[PDB]
Design an enzyme around this catalytic site. Structure first.
Site, PDB file in Angstrom:
ATOM      1  CB  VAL A  74      41.156  40.355  32.413  1.00  0.00           C
ATOM      2  CG1 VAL A  74      42.599  40.753  32.677  1.00  0.00           C
ATOM      3  CG2 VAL A  74      40.599  39.537  33.568  1.00  0.00           C
ATOM      4  N   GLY A  75      37.879  41.565  32.327  1.00  0.00           N
ATOM      5  CA  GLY A  75      36.524  41.245  31.895  1.00  0.00           C
ATOM      6  C   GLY A  75      35.488  41.965  32.735  1.00  0.00           C
ATOM      7  CE  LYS A  89      32.229  35.791  39.324  1.00  0.00           C
ATOM      8  NZ  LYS A  89      31.778  34.581  38.630  1.00  0.00           N
ATOM      9  CE1 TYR A  98      25.041  35.722  35.244  1.00  0.00           C
ATOM     10  CE2 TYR A  98      24.944  34.928  37.498  1.00  0.00           C
ATOM     11  CZ  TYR A  98      24.389  35.028  36.241  1.00  0.00           C
ATOM     12  OH  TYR A  98      23.177  34.431  35.978  1.00  0.00           O
ATOM     13  N   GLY A  99      29.909  40.037  37.487  1.00  0.00           N
ATOM     14  CA  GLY A  99      31.030  40.695  38.174  1.00  0.00           C
ATOM     15  C   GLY A  99      32.047  41.342  37.253  1.00  0.00           C
ATOM     16  CG  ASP A 110      25.329  30.301  28.541  1.00  0.00           C
ATOM     17  OD1 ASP A 110      25.158  30.283  27.300  1.00  0.00           O
ATOM     18  OD2 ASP A 110      25.751  31.310  29.141  1.00  0.00           O
TER      19      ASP A 110
HETATM   20  C1  LIG Z   1      26.050  32.592  39.687  1.00  0.00           C
HETATM   21  C2  LIG Z   1      27.056  31.587  39.193  1.00  0.00           C
HETATM   22  C3  LIG Z   1      28.004  31.989  38.259  1.00  0.00           C
HETATM   23  C4  LIG Z   1      28.931  31.069  37.799  1.00  0.00           C
HETATM   24  C5  LIG Z   1      28.939  29.755  38.277  1.00  0.00           C
HETATM   25  N1  LIG Z   1      29.928  28.822  37.729  1.00  0.00           N
HETATM   26  N2  LIG Z   1      29.582  27.663  37.329  1.00  0.00           N
HETATM   27  C6  LIG Z   1      30.664  27.025  36.836  1.00  0.00           C
HETATM   28  C7  LIG Z   1      30.717  25.617  36.258  1.00  0.00           C
HETATM   29  C8  LIG Z   1      29.485  25.405  35.390  1.00  0.00           C
HETATM   30  C9  LIG Z   1      31.975  25.400  35.394  1.00  0.00           C
HETATM   31  C10 LIG Z   1      30.661  24.567  37.360  1.00  0.00           C
HETATM   32  C11 LIG Z   1      31.721  27.890  36.938  1.00  0.00           C
HETATM   33  C12 LIG Z   1      31.242  29.058  37.501  1.00  0.00           C
HETATM   34  N3  LIG Z   1      32.010  30.244  37.754  1.00  0.00           N
HETATM   35  C13 LIG Z   1      33.267  30.537  37.285  1.00  0.00           C
HETATM   36  O1  LIG Z   1      33.885  29.747  36.619  1.00  0.00           O
HETATM   37  N4  LIG Z   1      33.851  31.750  37.584  1.00  0.00           N
HETATM   38  C14 LIG Z   1      35.227  32.069  37.144  1.00  0.00           C
HETATM   39  C15 LIG Z   1      35.498  33.480  36.632  1.00  0.00           C
HETATM   40  C16 LIG Z   1      36.897  33.463  35.992  1.00  0.00           C
HETATM   41  N5  LIG Z   1      37.196  34.545  35.045  1.00  0.00           N
HETATM   42  C17 LIG Z   1      38.311  34.540  34.225  1.00  0.00           C
HETATM   43  O2  LIG Z   1      39.111  33.614  34.261  1.00  0.00           O
HETATM   44  O3  LIG Z   1      38.505  35.609  33.392  1.00  0.00           O
HETATM   45  C18 LIG Z   1      38.817  35.530  31.999  1.00  0.00           C
HETATM   46  C19 LIG Z   1      37.782  36.337  31.217  1.00  0.00           C
HETATM   47  C20 LIG Z   1      40.205  36.130  31.811  1.00  0.00           C
HETATM   48  C21 LIG Z   1      38.788  34.100  31.448  1.00  0.00           C
HETATM   49  C22 LIG Z   1      27.989  29.357  39.208  1.00  0.00           C
HETATM   50  C23 LIG Z   1      27.049  30.272  39.672  1.00  0.00           C
END
Ligand SMILES: Cc1ccc(-n2nc(C(C)(C)C)cc2NC(=O)NCCCNC(=O)OC(C)(C)C)cc1
Lengths: 328, 266
Positions: free
Chosen positions: A29-30, A54, A34-35, A146
């Site tokens: 889906v993406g 992920k 980062y992955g 961001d």
């Molecule tokens: C390296 C790194 C990358 C991401 C994060 N990070 N940080 C946050 C905060 C700011 C909300 C706390 C959240 C993340 N990471 C994530 O949220 N990862 C989730 C990936 C979910 N993907 C996902 O739901 O896919 C679609 C495109 C269908 C929406 C931290 C560190």
């Protein structure tokens, strides 16, 4: 190896593997830095819930792997994305992370409206939850860095029908001017500037600071000023302390953006300047970073006491016209 | 600074504050090979090994405590035969350095750090050179991260200690000494059994008693279970007697010999 064999075979046996537990192949889906993210139901019976599964880019426990894990392992608020489980895969050393599957986001919603206005009860609810989540993160000294519509997820049908979920996946439209004038340090106020741009985007369906593409970015600045106007010394006193200030003075003339301002901009997009909604937006879109309100203060704005009150379900119990996320 | 006030909703607090009686039960495993005394001497020995590895690599004391907590947590529930503690020590530093945002310690630099410190600081315990290469560290790391249930963020007493002595208004007299006592508490099980502020109070009490400063009224005015603080004072006061009698350098080669050894495959 000189590492105990029984210990190794026990943990190996007992260890859960992503491919045994979850059905996910073909359901990507993406992509991104980062992955790769897959929409994944479970193989074994006991779930109707989809999950965002992920695979982190790369091998091992990288600095990005380590951080993402470190934080989300602690964070619990209904409007931050939730990490259900980590999978470490000893064979290839790839790290997998599970997250509850949010069907939609603000990039896809706004776009969908931009193909044909964005309902107002929804607009006020969307912002309120975005604020509640970001206040939580700021309270715990965790900056997003961001923010933008692509990173505001919204849950689909299920027990969390229409609830904003803040996320980070991987343009300069949502960046505060100080960043563009080379501020070498992220802050809470930089997030609030980004939330300002979204709100305006929600009300009008266009990005407020839409623009074609070092920290100094000229054309992006020209747009802020075309919308906002050029800041008076009095409005932002320590603009002179910004590292790319004299360059600003080299390339821009205050007079160019004379008689153009946020009221004149929002008036053009049919948002009334004596509305509580505008009066709030203005306090978010404040140019001097230390003159923006905090997330907490914005949640207490009388805009959220004005009829209609924001609802937990962003979709107001209505049918959802937005389509499900396509595979690739 | 991140998550700085989340202790009571922390993974630390909700999963890694262990019951003592559960801790000493899963320890009876290694107590068939090592006595109770020997086992705590081992704990000191590796607290000191992780310290030297921190010092050698130039690292803030907060990174060393995190590393030291990861080492405790692993062997808190697993036997000393499972992974070699000489491998597990630098692996904890390697991971802590990442979690505490100072950076990845390089392949070459990490392995030279291990090699040099055991060669220099601990020559008496280890007559053969540090044997492990970087692939080993990387493997052990995964086993360490799985064992911790990905619980990486760790609260330590130095923050509450500071806040307290600033509230007293005798930061200059007490902070150098109190901070040291807290470092010394990592020679014990305390970080697995009490919230950091309690260990902070405990140490801070000793400091004032060692420095003859009366702080009774200041202590009286706190809303904490002072019974629990007396438990920690007891243990601090004892570790120093443990220090006196323990002759690390003369004894530890024999004690490292007694450790239950790993079983390599069939
Ligand atoms: C390296 C790194 C990358 C991401 C994060 N990070 N940080 C946050 C905060 C700011 C909300 C706390 C959240 C993340 N990471 C994530 O949220 N990862 C989730 C990936 C979910 N993907 C996902 O739901 O896919 C679609 C495109 C269908 C929406 C931290 C560190």
């Amino acid at each position: 190896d000189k590492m105990d064999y029984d210990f190794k075979v026990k943990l190996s046996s007992e260890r859960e593997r992503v491919e045994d537990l979850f059905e996910y192949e073909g359901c990507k889906v993406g992509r991104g830095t980062y992955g790769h993210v897959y929409k994944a139901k479970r193989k074994d019976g006991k779930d109707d819930k989809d999950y965002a599964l992920k695979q982190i880019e790369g091998t091992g426990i990288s600095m990005s792997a380590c951080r993402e894990i470190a934080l989300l392992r602690e964070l619990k608020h209904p409007n931050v994305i939730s990490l259900q489980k980590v999978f470490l895969s000893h064979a290839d050393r790839k790290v997998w992370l599970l997250f509850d599957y949010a069907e939609h986001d603000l990039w896809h919603i706004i776009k969908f409206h931009r193909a044909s206005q964005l309902p107002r009860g929804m607009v006020k609810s969307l912002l309120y939850q975005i604020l509640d989540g970001i206040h939580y993160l700021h309270a715990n000294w965790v900056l997003h860095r961001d923010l933008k519509p692509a990173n505001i997820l919204v849950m689909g049908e299920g027990p969390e029908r229409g609830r904003v979920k803040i996320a980070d996946m991987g343009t300069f439209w949502y960046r505060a001017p100080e960043l563009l004038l080379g501020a070498r340090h992220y802050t809470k106020a930089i997030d609030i500037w980004a939330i300002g741009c979204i709100f305006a985007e929600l009300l009008t369906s266009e990005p407020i600071f839409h623009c074609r593409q070092n920290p100094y970015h000229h054309d992006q600045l020209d747009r802020i000023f075309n919308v906002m106007g050029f800041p008076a010394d009095k409005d932002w006193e320590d603009i002179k302390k910004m590292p790319e200030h004299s360059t600003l003075m080299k390339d821009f003339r205050r007079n160019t953006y004379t008689n153009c301002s946020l009221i004149k901009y929002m008036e053009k997009h049919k948002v009334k300047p004596d509305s509580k909604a505008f009066h709030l937006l203005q306090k978010l879109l404040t140019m001097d970073p230390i003159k923006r309100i905090t997330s907490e203060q914005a949640m207490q704005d009388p805009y959220f006491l004005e009829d209609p009150l924001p609802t937990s379900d962003v979709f107001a119990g209505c049918q959802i016209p937005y389509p499900k996320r396509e595979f690739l | 600074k991140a998550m700085a006030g989340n202790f009571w909703q922390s993974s630390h607090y909700l999963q890694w504050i262990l019951d003592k009686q559960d801790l000493l039960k899963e320890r009876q495993k290694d107590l068939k090979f090592l006595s109770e005394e020997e086992y705590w001497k081992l704990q000191i020995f590796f607290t000191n090994v992780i310290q030297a590895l921190g010092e050698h690599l130039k690292l803030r004391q907060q990174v060393i405590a995190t590393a030291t907590v990861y080492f405790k947590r692993f062997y808190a529930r697993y036997s000393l035969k499972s992974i070699d503690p000489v491998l597990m020590a630098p692996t904890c530093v390697f991971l802590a350095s990442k979690v505490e945002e100072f950076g990845v310690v390089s392949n070459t630099r990490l392995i030279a750090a291990a090699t040099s410190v055991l060669k220099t600081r601990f020559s008496y315990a280890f007559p053969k050179e540090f044997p492990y290469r970087m692939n080993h560290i990387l493997e052990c790391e995964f086993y360490l991260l799985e064992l911790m249930d990905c619980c990486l963020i760790v609260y330590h007493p130095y923050r509450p200690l500071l806040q307290y002595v600033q509230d007293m208004g005798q930061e200059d007299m007490l902070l150098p000494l109190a901070w040291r006592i807290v470092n010394d508490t990592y020679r014990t099980d305390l970080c697995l059994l009490y919230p950091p502020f309690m260990i902070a109070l405990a140490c801070l009490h000793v400091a004032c008693v060692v420095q003859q400063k009366d702080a009774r009224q200041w202590f009286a005015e706190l809303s904490v279970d002072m019974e629990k603080i007396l438990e920690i004072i007891r243990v601090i006061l004892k570790l120093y007697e443990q220090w006196k009698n323990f002759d690390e350098r003369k004894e530890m080669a024999t004690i490292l010999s007694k450790m239950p050894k790993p079983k390599p495959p069939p």
